[PDB]
């Protein structure tokens, strides 16, 4: 509207486009989802365009295969790997768009059993593509999508604690307000369960396959993000089964990937309340971690020394 209302609100670049897409989704879900599908296609450098009759008739496997036939066979460059200057902030805007999209949808659209299933199915199929541009773009999107979903689960816990205290405060006084708080408590837990199913689909369908990708940057993206999930949501992500992925990646050939493993572990060991969960991991990968304090790469060795110092101070 007016200059004052626009300045007072101060919508970011990515929130302005997300709110426009959400309103487009309320008018026609298929057209908005088609625009979102073509977004991830065009972000990968693909020049193809999915049409609405393709979206309504074809499966993701056929759609992706048709989009695969629309790449420049000579060039392997795509927006996530171009130097600039039109691509300096694209990666930052790409990651921010995903977090803003899910944050603005977290109270209704995310639970409609159509939007998230379409996004995750698309990103899962693109993550298994032979085209590096498809794997890189979809995996980065899926990793940021998981982190956005963790933040949704974090906000749900806050709403669950508020509803619980409002229930017990009203209980210590059955009317309509009590049964309404009982129903919201049941509904919020169902939201948590549905968000966890989405996180499991991304983890089992994308992460466990992309963390050992042939491209080093794709491995670095997966390792960096699982460390974020382990710090934000340790009850579900910090376990011996998931720590095996970080432990096995300590032996990576590329220094950029080993560097991300160490910094991921640093954020876990720097929290004293997480040390009992890391005891078995420390004993299993002690020799590899201490051996990296003299890694052939200087930047890796510095962070391994920082990690060992945190391990020692924790005990």
Report on the structure:
With 315 residues, the chain is mainly α. It has a domain at 238-315. It has helices spanning 3-9, 13-27, 29-43, 52-57, 60-68, 90-105, 115-127, 132-171, 176-210, 216-232, 234-237, 240-249, 255-269, 279-284, 286-291, 298-314. The longest helix has 40 residues, at 132-171. It starts with a helix and ends with a helix.
Number of strands: 0
Q: Biggest sheet, open or closed, and with what strands and sense? A: none
Tally of helical runs: 16
Between the first and last Cα atoms, what is the distance in angstroms? Answer: 58 Å
Helix content: over 70%
Would you list the SSEs in sequence order as H and E?
A: HHHHHHHHHHHHHHHH
What class would the helix/strand composition place it in? mainly alpha
Q: What is the gyration radius calculated from CA atoms?
A: 22 Å
* Beta-strand share of residues: under 5%
Label the overall shape: globular
PDB class: gene regulation
Keywords: Cohesin, chromosome segregation, gene regulation
Assembly: monomeric
Entry title: Crystal structure of the N-terminal region of human cohesin subunit STAG1
């Amino acid at each position: 509207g007016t200059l004052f209302e626009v300045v007072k609100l101060g919508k970011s670049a990515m929130q302005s486009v997300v709110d426009d897409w959400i309103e487009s989704y309320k008018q026609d879900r298929d057209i908005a989802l088609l625009d979102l599908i073509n977004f991830f296609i065009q972000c990968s450098g693909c020049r193809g365009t999915v049409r609405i009759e393709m979206f309504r008739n074809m499966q993701n496997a056929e759609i992706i295969r048709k989009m695969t036939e629309e790449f420049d066979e000579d060039s392997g460059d795509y927006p996530l790997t171009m130097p600039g200057p039109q691509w300096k902030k694209f990666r930052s805007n790409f990651c921010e768009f995903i977090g803003v999209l899910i944050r603005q949808c977290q109270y209704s659209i995310i639970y409609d059993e159509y939007m998230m299933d379409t996004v995750i199915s698309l990103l899962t199929g693109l993550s298994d593509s032979q085209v590096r541009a498809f794997r890189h773009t979809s995996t980065l999107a899926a990793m940021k999508l998981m982190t956005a979903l963790v933040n949704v689960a974090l906000n749900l816990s806050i709403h669950q604690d508020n509803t619980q205290r409002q229930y017990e405060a009203e209980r210590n006084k059955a009317n309509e307000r009590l049964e309404l708080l009982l129903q919201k408590r049941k509904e919020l837990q169902e939201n948590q369960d549905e968000i966890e199913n989405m996180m499991n689909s991304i983890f089992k369908g994308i992460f466990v396959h992309r963390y050992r990708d042939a491209i080093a940057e794709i491995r670095a993206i997966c390792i960096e993000e699982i460390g974020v999930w382990m710090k934000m949501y340790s009850d579900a992500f910090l376990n011996d089964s998931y720590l095996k992925y970080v432990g096995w990646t300590l032996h990576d050939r590329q220094g950029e990937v080993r560097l991300k493993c160490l910094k991921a572990l640093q954020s876990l060991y720097t929290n004293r309340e997480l040390f009992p969960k890391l005891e078995l991991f420390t004993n299993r990968f002690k020799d590899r971690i201490v051996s990296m304090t003299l890694d052939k790469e200087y930047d890796v060795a510095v962070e391994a020394i920082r990690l060992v110092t945190l391990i020692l101070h924790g005990s």
